């Protein structure tokens, strides 16, 4: 299938060499593509220390040469993309092209060689003013002068290089901070131009608000369903998976142009710790919900080894090392495969017997996914289109039966279920 049809593994902070070595496992996990952290040169602050708390330096470019101390060299990136292809895995690169580091003295002469390359570092003030949001600085990070056709070619050359090194797609960091052709009199052809590459798949991080212009960006790339992420999280928090709150994407953009998640690296690693509270079960459950969906493209966030239950960085690994083994959890991968096999099937979300603690998604008449957010097991008995027969839970222990259109079986507490003919 295409990248848009499958699931994506966010290999957050995974070095190029780490990725290359876990490639067979990534494949067996049912992922169609992996997303790396920024691969360009950055300001390796705090003396380049690899403590997981230093994750943010990767978002402070100093040049657009490929390679850095956190992820590895440009050669290792290439080898990584090659090892990925040996398994049909696509590679999506996190492109930070809206800004550079805040430290002007760290910026490379290479960048400074570009005449009038920056809008300055005047921090945004009015997040309701498309002018201030796009033309000024985010957190003090020098804002690229994207209206300058010369910066465009410099940045696009970087993207083209990545594609030549084996990259297959992009994730445009802070995409909401780069003007569109119709943003008043300060608009540019930045997006029309840079999205014109051989990239197979590309989406932009556009966190939603009154001025994010979600639908506008969708014309040039897929977009993030940030609101939906909060909808899911709230559901997980209250152990209430009622479909009246988690079926709508809370966005004007339709599923087919949406990239979804249970949590993002931002909601997890920032000092706000807004999603850090979740446990692995909360993730197995949330992932069952979003990854069972039709159209949208789910992004699985790989957490730091030992991370969760409110603790961001427990110190059991550092930047570069692989994340926890949840990305290849039986429940998680079973759902990945379900997502892949059902591609093209319609969907039907519900809450069996009116119990909102039970999520159910029936895709066409080929497969069903159940999610029990409650702390007690539930003997299900609901309508289904699956052909009569016995179905072993692919996501875990247990089995179910389908007789005369009746789906019966027990779904353990805090558990996921995935059923469909072999
Ligand atoms: Ca900008
Ligand atoms: Ca490739
Ligand atoms: Ca904490």
Curated annotation (Swiss-Prot):
One of its GO terms (biological process) is carbohydrate metabolic process. Its main location: secreted. The active site is at residues 173, 205. It catalyses: Endohydrolysis of (1->4)-alpha-D-glucosidic linkages in polysaccharides containing three or more (1->4)-alpha-linked D-glucose units. Binds 2 calcium ions per subunit. It comes from the Bacteria. Ca(2+) 2 binds at residues 166, 168. The record marks 266 as: Transition state stabilizer. This is Alpha-amylase. It comes from Bacillus subtilis (strain 168). The lineage of its organism: Bacteria, Bacillati, Bacillota, Bacilli, Bacillales. The gene is amyE. The chain holds residues 45 to 466 of 659 of the full protein.
């Amino acid at each position: 299938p295409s990248i848009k049809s499958g699931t994506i593994l966010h290999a957050w902070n995974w070095s190029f060499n780490t990725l290359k070595h876990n490639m067979k496992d990534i494949h067996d996990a049912g992922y169609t593509a992996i997303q790396t952290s920024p691969i360009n040169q950055v300001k390796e602050g705090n003396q380049g220390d690899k403590s997981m708390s230093n994750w943010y330096w990767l978002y402070q470019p100093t040049s657009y040469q490929i390679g850095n101390r956190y992820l590895g060299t440009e050669q290792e990136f290439k080898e990584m993309c090659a090892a990925a292809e040996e398994y049909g895995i696509k590679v999506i690169v996190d492109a930070v092209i809206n800004h550079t580091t805040f430290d002007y003295a760290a910026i490379s002469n290479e960048v400074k060689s570009i005449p009038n390359w920056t809008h300055g570092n005047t921090q945004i003030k009015n997040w309701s003013d498309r002018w201030d949001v796009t033309q000024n600085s985010l957190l003090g990070l020098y804002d690229w002068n994207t209206q300058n056709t010369q910066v465009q070619s410099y940045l696009k050359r970087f993207l083209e290089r990545a594609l030549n090194d084996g990259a297959d797609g992009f994730r445009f960091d802070a995409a909401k901070h780069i003007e569109l052709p119709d943003d008043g009199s300060y608009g540019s052809q930045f997006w029309p131009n840079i999205t014109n590459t051989s990239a197979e798949f590309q989406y932009g991080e556009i966190l939603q608000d009154s001025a994010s212009r979600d639908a506008a960006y969708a014309n040039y790339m897929d977009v993030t369903a940030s609101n939906y992420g909060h909808s899911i999280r709230s559901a997980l928090k209250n152990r209430n998976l009622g479909v009246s709150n988690i079926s709508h994407y809370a966005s004007d953009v339709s599923a087919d142009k949406l990239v979804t998640w249970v949590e993002s690296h931002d909601t997890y690693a920032n000092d706000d710790e807004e999603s850090t509270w979740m446990s692995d079960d909360d993730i197995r459950l949330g992932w069952a919900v979003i990854a069972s969906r039709s159209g949208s493209t789910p992004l699985f966030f790989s957490r730091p080894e030992g991370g969760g239950n409110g603790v961001r960085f427990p110190g059991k690994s550092q930047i570069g090392d692989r994340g926890s083994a949840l990305f290849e959890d039986q429940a998680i991968t079973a759902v990945n495969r379900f997502h892949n096999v059902m591609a093209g099937q319609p969907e039907e979300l519900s809450n069996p017997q009116g119990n909102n603690q039970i999520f159910m998604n029936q895709r066409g008449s080929h497969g069903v996914v159940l999610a029990n957010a409650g702390s007690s097991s539930v003997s299900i008995n609901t309508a289904t289109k699956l052909p009569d027969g016995r179905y072993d839970n692919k996501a875990g222990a247990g089995s179910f039966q389908v007789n005369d259109g009746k789906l019966t079986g027990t779904i353990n507490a805090r558990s996921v279920a995935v059923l469909y003919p072999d």
